[PDB]
Amino acid sequence: LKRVVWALCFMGSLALLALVCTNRIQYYFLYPHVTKLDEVAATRLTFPAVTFCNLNEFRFSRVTKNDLYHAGELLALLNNRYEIPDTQTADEKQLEILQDKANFRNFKPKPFNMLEFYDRAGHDIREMLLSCFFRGEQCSPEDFKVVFTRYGKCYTFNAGQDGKPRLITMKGGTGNGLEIMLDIQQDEYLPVWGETDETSFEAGIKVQIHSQDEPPLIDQLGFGVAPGFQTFVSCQEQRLIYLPPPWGDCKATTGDSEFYDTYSITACRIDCETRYLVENCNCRMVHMPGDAPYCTPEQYKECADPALDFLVEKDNEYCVCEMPCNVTRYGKELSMVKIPSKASAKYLAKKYNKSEQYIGENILVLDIFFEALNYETIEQKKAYEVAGLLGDIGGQMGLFIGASILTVLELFDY
Amino acid sequence: LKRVVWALCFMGSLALLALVCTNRIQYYFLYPHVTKLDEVAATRLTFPAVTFCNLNEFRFSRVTKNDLYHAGELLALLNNRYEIPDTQTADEKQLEILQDKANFRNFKPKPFNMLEFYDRAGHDIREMLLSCFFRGEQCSPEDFKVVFTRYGKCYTFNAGQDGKPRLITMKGGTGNGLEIMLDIQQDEYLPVWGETDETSFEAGIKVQIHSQDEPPLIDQLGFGVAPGFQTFVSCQEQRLIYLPPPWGDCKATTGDSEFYDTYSITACRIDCETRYLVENCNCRMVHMPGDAPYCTPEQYKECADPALDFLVEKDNEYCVCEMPCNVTRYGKELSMVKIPSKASAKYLAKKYNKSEQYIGENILVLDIFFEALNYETIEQKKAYEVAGLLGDIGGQMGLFIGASILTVLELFDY
Amino acid sequence: LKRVVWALCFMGSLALLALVCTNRIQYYFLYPHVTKLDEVAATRLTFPAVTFCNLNEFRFSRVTKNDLYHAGELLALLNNRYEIPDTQTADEKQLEILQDKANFRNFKPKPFNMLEFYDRAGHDIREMLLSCFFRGEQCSPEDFKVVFTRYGKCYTFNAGQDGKPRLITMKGGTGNGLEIMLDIQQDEYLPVWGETDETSFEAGIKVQIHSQDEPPLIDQLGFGVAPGFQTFVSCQEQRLIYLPPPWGDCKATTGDSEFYDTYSITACRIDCETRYLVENCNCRMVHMPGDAPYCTPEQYKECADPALDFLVEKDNEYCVCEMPCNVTRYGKELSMVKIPSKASAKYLAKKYNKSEQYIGENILVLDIFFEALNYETIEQKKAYEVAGLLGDIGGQMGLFIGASILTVLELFDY
Ligand SMILES: [Cl-]
Ligand SMILES: [Cl-]
Ligand SMILES: [Cl-]
């Protein structure tokens, strides 16, 4: 009667238990994850490395007759007949110089490679750096490590190598970071007579803020700074931590991955770009690692350059990288004020033995610091551990029928 | 004795179970949610649409005597007596022109509407676009779709309509995005003699980056770009996914919502603004959808303009929109360098048949790209599913008393 | 036989239960937390306070002979012998003035304090503010509250004090925020003849956006705005809510913490900086709270200034603050256009009785507003409540052995 009528109700209770338990178990086998995000004002924070590059790759006063011979075409300074292009943007003063050192009448070529050309004619930290201060202490060129990029001879402050103890940061604000005054030296910019990958229409510098153990990709990922301004960059360190499989695609940062000691997206890209250029050109660009021969100006103009433009512009399948397990991103907010003021133009002009207009067209101040909330963690965390699954399917087993693994295994037998 | 003394302890065990189970069940009926945030370097990413507008709405050379007659007051070029205001910012060259075409002695008005005025006098992509490149390929005006905003005749790159396959992006960096050189043509800016909603004190352009299926609100939400700089915009695609009720207020993006095929905040605003202007003015602005008649200059000056200023400035209750279930936000970091350099000014001047000063005051380069971590997901996820509640209240039922639904329903009866 | 052979299997079942239950209980005693992040288009949002400061601290026309006597050395206008430094950046017009009022032949010093000097010579909101509009309504200096910073006499719009109902914001876009036109008055900038903490090489202003009940730290945390541009700041209100111990280090915002009614990182810093300066100098700077005597120019130059530079640059242990439970951060995206255009330069020049060049070097427009997704919540939430632990260890107890607290306590006794 009523005792056996709610045994069918018991059949319904079993029917329910089936759907709910298969729910929590499919949910387990989706491997769901959630996010733990903590923005905080840190302490003992490690100051990142700061790489910068002048937008003019070579110095007009340092280009020699041999430099002009080997590389004048790459720089659009000579046509294919080793002469000044008749379609040149004449300057009565500059053109006299160039056609004086473009006179190869008594000239016999001498050995030449691009790395020495960049290292020698590239802008010099010792005459660009007008002022550097970190947390109240003044820097020198000794504190900037020479690094070569596609821009040429570039510099990294707080590179952290050289056994030099990396610098730290405690609070937020300008006084707890870097400030540098620079002269971009527009009077040393090479004439632009055509368009190549080595000349530019812009005056200023390129900057990129990165981990000490992450290489720079300043050509693609950096930001610019204009002459005649003071730029404030308020930063924030964002540490991103991902889960390995099966929860997500994530590569161990101690990656057994060629040219660099640390695995990062940028390093993976530079690796592949190097393999690609060596493979297709038998030639490496000045900034690439490895041991291939550096490209000659003809190899730069004909093979290496379009190879890299292809990799960073058109390629969709050859070169793609995985996500690491640890990634460091730097949020930033930029801001400008004008330099110099009328009250100070004559002061700066006098101090550096330069014209007032020159100061207006070449001088530049850069402040790099962190805000109050200077450190941020974005860590992926597992959302349904196996134990919580067993405890849940357990409260579900016990709910509708009050069974156990003993009751089943024992009752499945006896 | 001791057997019946811990039956009171059993009463305490029941007392505990009550509070804990009512805890997990109230917690269920709060409908709590958490967040799943994944910043990643994507692939096959869809490039957004990029809308831009010159800050000068009309071209001084294209304003005709009929255009000046109908609209000269809206542009503060004529007072209420159809004449040059005596309080004009005289220019010996410009004033001769305007008062030459403000001579209505032999003039009889001709038909006129604002849409044709904007379309004709508005700046032209074919003479502003000095250079466009996307991922190594050069663009033409064919790649820019004409869109009308409150600025006038504006343009959208990669609008994605026209059956043109939307463009994709793979890596981070400048080479994997758009770069355009523009001439803002300050020599064609109309004289500003007063303050209206059609004239501006600033030179440059306005830009807004949006989904192909999200309309632009460039007047309110866009950013500016100044002449004489190259601006870098490092972007990041942020996909935001919300939960529908009862977990949150969230509107289905396939919204059955008038003028556009997709529901977005911006489209909802443009919808309501159109209804409002039609209702209160019997008149639609040139950029609004629907089928009302376009406003005459008198309707613009007297009714439509203050109506829209009211909606976008003062309104607090008439026009408010819900949150969609899918939202696309684009993070961005801006950066400038100066253009032109001294080395290149004469080059650019020669190439475009323009003065060096003109190049300094009108020329502008814009790079739009993504960083390495170019894609970000912010998805709301349910925090306490019903199954996990039952499994939990289950481990709680089994803990203190070891009961089941059978034990109760059966014991509640027999 | 087979009945007693799976009692050893029962021993294995117990072995499993031990590890899994000790897993969920250690997990409980790690006190894990997760994050609830909601970016939304809000309504009835409270507009923050906006503090700004001219980069020139004193006005050259307001510096009197007594002001020059007491403070001329602090400003690098006089050497240690109360005379013009022979290494001055001469200006035939300015130098006549200064050496006219540096003539102390018939001068006897008069009482002097830095607060009155700042208040009097500091730039005036009533002659800098050329235009202010909030949500369609125009502002006056009445809407700006005077606040003193290390820059001097500064101003805060929508300070929210004075019983003035704080302003609200509804939508995203320029029309739903503040726009102001300013003259930085480079013609009133004091000559810079040396480097001190009161003079600057830059022209423009400093801005900081903060809660009405959070003090400004504009020297360290603010951003700059350059003359000759219109700058757009697209903002986003981010409310961060942390967990108190034992889940995290977090201080109650109703903090019983000295000089201010609300606990914030900035207020904690200003508190400690004040204690430090009073302790080490018997002296407070003009912008610090409390009741110590203000510093004399000699105390500024010799003790107070290097004390604060030390605190904001070098200090690593003396002054460090805890994290509050509620923090308000404002995301922002900046953007510039040039001002004035050629079409409008003469207009603005005429309107304000100023030269066209002056307009180009001193005039500045600032728009502060929010984007569509104008409000963001980042709330830490508990990840494993005690009830869910008991329900889980419960489904685990019931799973392997089907026990209960009664079964144990009763069986541990009888
Ligand atoms: Cl690559
Ligand atoms: Cl609206
Ligand atoms: Cl401090």
Residue numbers in the entry:
A (entry chain A), B (entry chain A), C (entry chain A): 42 to 455
Show passages lifted from the paper:
Acid sensing ion channels (ASICs) are voltage-insensitive and proton-gated members of the epithelial sodium channel/degenerin (ENaC/DEG) superfamily of ion channels that assemble as homo- or heterotrimeric sodium-selective ion channels and are expressed throughout vertebrate central and peripheral nervous systems. ASICs exhibit a simple three-state gating scheme, populating a non-conducting resting state at high pH, opening upon exposure to protons and quickly desensitizing, recovering proton-sensitivity only upon return to high pH. The homotrimeric splice variant ASIC1a is highly enriched in the central nervous system (CNS) and participates in numerous physiological processes including learning and memory and nociception. ASIC1a activity is modulated by endogenous divalent cations including Zn2+, Mg2+, and Ca2+ and the modification of ASIC1a gating by extracellular Ca2+ has been an area of active investigation.
